[PDB]
Design a protein around this ligand. Structure first.
Ligand SMILES: [Ca+2]
Length: 125
């Protein structure tokens, strides 16, 4: 599914993502726009054999289990396939774990490159 920015905003708020680790909503939305274009089915295969899944591009070496990644840690304790469906509840709950361990949005390479220090007025909720 390709979510509309306001459905994304409603989900974020409902999952208590506003101000989580002092991360504002426009930051979470810009991240999701540059990571996946809001595509809940987005996937990216990496050089180390892992794959990034869903709207927040959650990785199968550290966070989710896909059954084919070397050195999987499955830290969110979830099948990666659950990150390719249309409900982003579990996707958002995993992202909170990622962001909580990093104390910020640094795990996401698109946020750093396309959101940090740029205008976020296009991404307001
Ligand atoms: Ca999901």
């Amino acid at each position: 599914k390709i979510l509309k920015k306001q459905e994304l905003c409603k989900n974020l708020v409902a999952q208590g993502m506003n101000g989580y680790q002092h991360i504002t909503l426009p930051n979470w939305v810009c991240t999701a726009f540059h990571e996946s274009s809001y595509n809940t089915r987005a996937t990216n295969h990496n050089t180390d054999g892992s794959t990034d899944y869903g709207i927040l591009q959650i990785n199968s070496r550290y966070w989710c289990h896909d059954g084919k990644t070397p050195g999987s840690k499955n830290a969110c304790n979830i099948s990666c396939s659950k990150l390719l469906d249309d409900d982003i509840t579990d996707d958002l709950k995993c992202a909170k774990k990622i962001a909580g361990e990093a104390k910020g949005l640094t795990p996401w390479v698109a946020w750093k490159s396309k959101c940090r220090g740029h205008d976020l007025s296009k991404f307001k909720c």
